[PDB]
Design a protein around this ligand. Structure first.
Ligand SMILES: *[C@@H]1O[C@H](CO)[C@@H](O[C@@H]2O[C@H](CO)[C@@H](O)[C@H](O)[C@H]2NC(C)=O)[C@H](O)[C@H]1NC(C)=O
Ligand SMILES: *[C@@H]1O[C@H](CO)[C@@H](O[C@@H]2O[C@H](CO)[C@@H](O)[C@H](O)[C@H]2NC(C)=O)[C@H](O)[C@H]1NC(C)=O
Ligand code: NAG
Ligand code: NAG
Ligand code: CO
Ligand code: CO
Lengths: 538, 538
């Protein structure tokens, strides 16, 4: 065909469509490309099979079905909560890819590949926050995104072939293989694939750097507020086996570790919606029932041992955190304290009880170390500072410091690292003004949501999106976010070197280069408190 | 006599002398006024008796004998060390008072009463650094000072009547009773006696607020680098007996706790220089062999209990610290490392060894907390930063944090407190460059030593001296260092209130107002580490 919209993929022909960006610059899109067999019936829980080849021309004009997942209804139809809720029908047949190329169609352009986040229980590529048209057109890159299986449906583990674990990661892996085989046909370069993700998506990106099966499938990596050394990122084979049995028990299935065939058989027979709804039992803050696991094929060691020994992809990294990571998770957890309303505060007594609840696995002498490290000693009983203390202890432990470990371990092995601290509140932010720069706020600006003027983003926010979109794309192209010839509009992002630990603050009216971020609080979590538990355990 | 230089005291007459203050201005001085029977022979170690009345007119014109103590000759003749050594001849007959009045002679002026410091083992009022002429003449106040017994001669305890303890403080108490009975005859107000001291002199001054015996002998208090809850300020009455028995053992006297009369008798017979030069056995950093004790008369409870209950004088307080309180004591103690020379530094392993030797009583799980709290996580193995960390751990624990606690409890019992942080180096400081603003560095400036034209102080340093001399004298006069009308050259010193905890930075080119200072580091020593040791120690 002389038509550019039709593209001969390795398994068949697909017809795309030309779509207007919100900027007014046209782009070619291909939405809902089948990259794998629908994991249905006996294929549930297992690793994906490549899609059966088709005869004729399939129209890839519609956003695909999202994977079966729970829906966030705790705050009803609250725009800040519902923006992450899935916007396409929930189906087990969710294994699809979306490609968006700029106009005119490039030759061998840099490929930016988005892997979504939702604590490995939720999320989808089809959300409007992940719109590719801005990032593609404004920066001249092939923006790609994929669906992977989430929750128990993508991460059930029993230490058996029929529930081998990491099925969601192998979904991502098979998509990376697809991009390598086919993205050149859409105007991309297979050798310049940059993986970028947020939260569990950023964790996923880090596991792809560590893993052997995906070591030769991409080039560079961006990691927004996530890393493979996070407490929640992985779970042990011993605990993962028990939770699958708990799921079977809760759903009404045979749930004995002696005979594990009977459990999976009926689990595959159950409705996928009742399966996901009965996952959440008694779990603490920021720990998710079904997440990645050290299986043997994808990963054959814990990410710490890979990181300690130095066994990871020798490539550039761009990573970072936000100032208020914890609040989002302490909103959904701790519901009675921290209500979704304006001007909430925490009294010292309420703060003292929260460290017990937010850290239920630590002795008591360790809990004394936590109350000292996270206290505003200028005004110890300040209701606003005590609320802030809760955000930081959760945010540092579960996100910021784990990004720092990963980034610092990449630095002192020779690779160039570029750390950010995202410090900006959107002017019309639906959440309370005390919540600050929450986990996932950066996403709105990296994907060019302010360039859509039908949303009421300011002029400086539009300039700020254009600013960080360049850093992201510049890095994906050449391995440096910095421009070729420096500018006042585009300040210097220095390397996060091992000896220096520098980072660039990302905000409206700044270019402040700090060091860390928050090295003392991370030193607490990663060095001090571990040996304090080791000392006081006996 | 209508001659003004003579004054008929309660025990006789004395004649003073007119002399020039270094500046050029003229003052009346009365040097070596006896206030006690020489504590000689039977009266050694016991509390002082008042002076026997004399006939005629005593020529009170020569500076008094310094009390028996050791001479600092580890560095030989280093000007920075020899300035604290005694400049008048050593004698047991040392219980004298100095009075210096400005001209024209006032009528009912504020009395600024100086108590010196030397770890309760050393010091004298006659030192050229404590030059009263400049202060008196510049601020129009009656500057008074006194000689109190130091070392074992001043503070020996065996729990007997013949060695009751606190003789040095009872010397000060009697000296305060003299100033109350007599200072109206020199032109001073007995009701406006403001005590002021540094190091152990500030401790002394602080205990006078606590004490029942000296409660009604003065008005206000100024406290430089000192506090009654300092670890070195007092020792236990249990320990202090053992200290005396070890001193008796060293000199060759009976050291049997069953028979204490033979010990004190034998000790009374020995030469006073033998006694002082055999006190320093195996004592760690910032802990002195003979210091104050809870006796029953001067103090009938520990300073911590009196602060717990609010049992102290209801008045104003002007207290503070310097930035580098520790180095001075880390130079003399621990001399193999950190020696007296330019550009010295401490490596990580030397820091790790230093924390063991500067805190040898803690259990090791506590050492991990100290190293964590006093390491620069920006650059953990920086030799400069590891050195400064040693200054702080000693400077905080022994000085800064006890000053803060005393100011805090005062502030939150409704008293008007004023906190400072002295941050200024003399331009011609003989000590090394790395030492910074060391312990007792402010004394030269509060006493008006920069106004001496034979010395080479800068004109900015002369202004800075006149600046703080005004604050001090304003406080002594009114209970507030800030001037009435609020001058532009004199910045606002806000009250160190219980809620805010504001302190003024005292430097050349700064009027910076902070919080604390070092509240986080003081919460470590006073809040966290105490409950750690109790958690860990079995
Ligand atoms: C989309 O697929 C459908 C069916 O698989 C096709 O839709 C038709 O194609 C042409 C497009 O100009 C028109 O006749 C109608 O829109 C549809 N007619 C019929 C008979 O199906 C088509 O192959 C694909 N879309 C396009 C734009 O080619
Ligand atoms: C210091 O004391 C002396 C002796 O009590 C005072 O009297 C002087 O005594 C000497 C004898 O050594 C006579 O030569 C002088 O004439 C006396 N001096 C005066 C001024 O009368 C002496 O007055 C006292 N010192 C001062 C400065 O008055
Ligand atoms: C913010 O920008 C303004 C000029 O637009 C300028 O004052 C400065 O760069 C920033 N403001 C500060 C640092 O107060
Ligand atoms: C204090 O420092 C500032 C720096 O901005 C300078 O302008 C000023 O001249 C300094 N003060 C004096 C008295 O020199
Ligand atoms: Co059962
Ligand atoms: Co013996």
């Amino acid at each position: 065909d002389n038509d550019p919209l039709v593209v001969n993929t390795d398994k068949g022909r697909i017809r795309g469509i030309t779509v207007d960006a919100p900027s007014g610059k046209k782009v070619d899109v291909w939405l809902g490309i089948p990259y794998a067999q629908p994991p249905v019936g006996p294929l549930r829980f297992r690793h994906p099979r490549p899609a059966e080849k088709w005869t004729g021309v399939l129209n890839t004009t519609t956003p695909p079905n999202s994977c079966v997942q729970i829906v966030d209804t705790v705050f009803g139809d609250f725009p800040g909560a519902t923006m992450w809720n899935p916007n396409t029908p929930l189906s087990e047949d969710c294994l699809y890819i979306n490609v968006v190329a700029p106009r005119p169609r490039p030759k061998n352009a840099a490929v930016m590949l988005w892997i979504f986040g939702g604590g490995f229980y939720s999320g989808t590529a089809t959300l409007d926050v992940y719109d590719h048209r801005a990032l593609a057109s404004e920066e001249n890159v092939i923006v790609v995104s994929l669906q992977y299986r989430v929750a128990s449906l993508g991460f059930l583990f029993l230490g058996t072939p029929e529930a081998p674990g990491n099925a969601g990661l192998f979904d991502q892996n098979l998509a990376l293989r697809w991009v390598r085989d086919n993205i050149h046909r859409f105007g991309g370069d297979p050798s310049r694939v940059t993986l970028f993700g947020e939260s569990a998506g950023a964790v996923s990106v880090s596991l792809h750097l560590l893993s052997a099966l995906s070591r030769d499938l991409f080039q560079r990596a961006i990691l927004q507020s996530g890393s493979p050394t996070a407490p929640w990122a992985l779970v042990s084979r011993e605990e993962a086996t028990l939770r699958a049995l708990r799921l079977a028990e809760a759903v009404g299935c045979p749930h004995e570790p002696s005979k594990l065939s009977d459990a999976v058989e009926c689990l595959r027979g159950k409705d996928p919606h009742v399966l996901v709804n009965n996952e959440w039992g008694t779990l603490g803050i920021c720990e998710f029932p079904f997440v990645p696991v050290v299986d043997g094929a994808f990963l054959d060691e814990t990410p710490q041992r890979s990181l300690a020994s130095g066994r990871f992809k020798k490539t550039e990294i761009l990573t970072g955190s936000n100032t208020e990571e914890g609040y989002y998770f302490i909103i959904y957890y701790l519901t009675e304290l921290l209500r979704k309303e304006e001007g909430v505060t925490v009294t010292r007594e309420e703060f003292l009880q929260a460290v017990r609840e937010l850290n239920p696995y630590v002795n008591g002498a360790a809990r004394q170390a936590i109350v000292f490290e996270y206290t505003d000693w200028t005004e110890p009983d300040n209701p606003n500072s005590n609320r802030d203390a809760l955000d930081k202890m959760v945010g540092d432990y579960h996100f910021t410091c784990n990004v720092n470990e990963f980034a610092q371990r990449y630095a002192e092995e020779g690779n160039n690292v570029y750390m950010y601290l995202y410090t900006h509140r959107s002017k019309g932010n639906p959440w309370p003004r005390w919540t600050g720069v929450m986990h996932g706020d950066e996403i709105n600006y990296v994907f060019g949501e302010p360039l859509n003027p039908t949303l009421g983003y300011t002029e400086d926010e539009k300039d700020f999106s254009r600013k960080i979109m360049r850093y992201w794309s510049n890095f994906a192209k050449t391995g440096n976010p910095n421009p070729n010839t420096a500018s006042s509009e585009f300040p210097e992002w220095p390397k996060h070197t091992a000896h220096g630990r520098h980072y660039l603050e990302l905000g409206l009216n700044t270019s402040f280069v700090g060091r860390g971020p928050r090295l003392r609080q991370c030193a607490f979590w990663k060095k001090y408190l571990p040996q304090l538990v080791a000392a006081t355990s006996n």
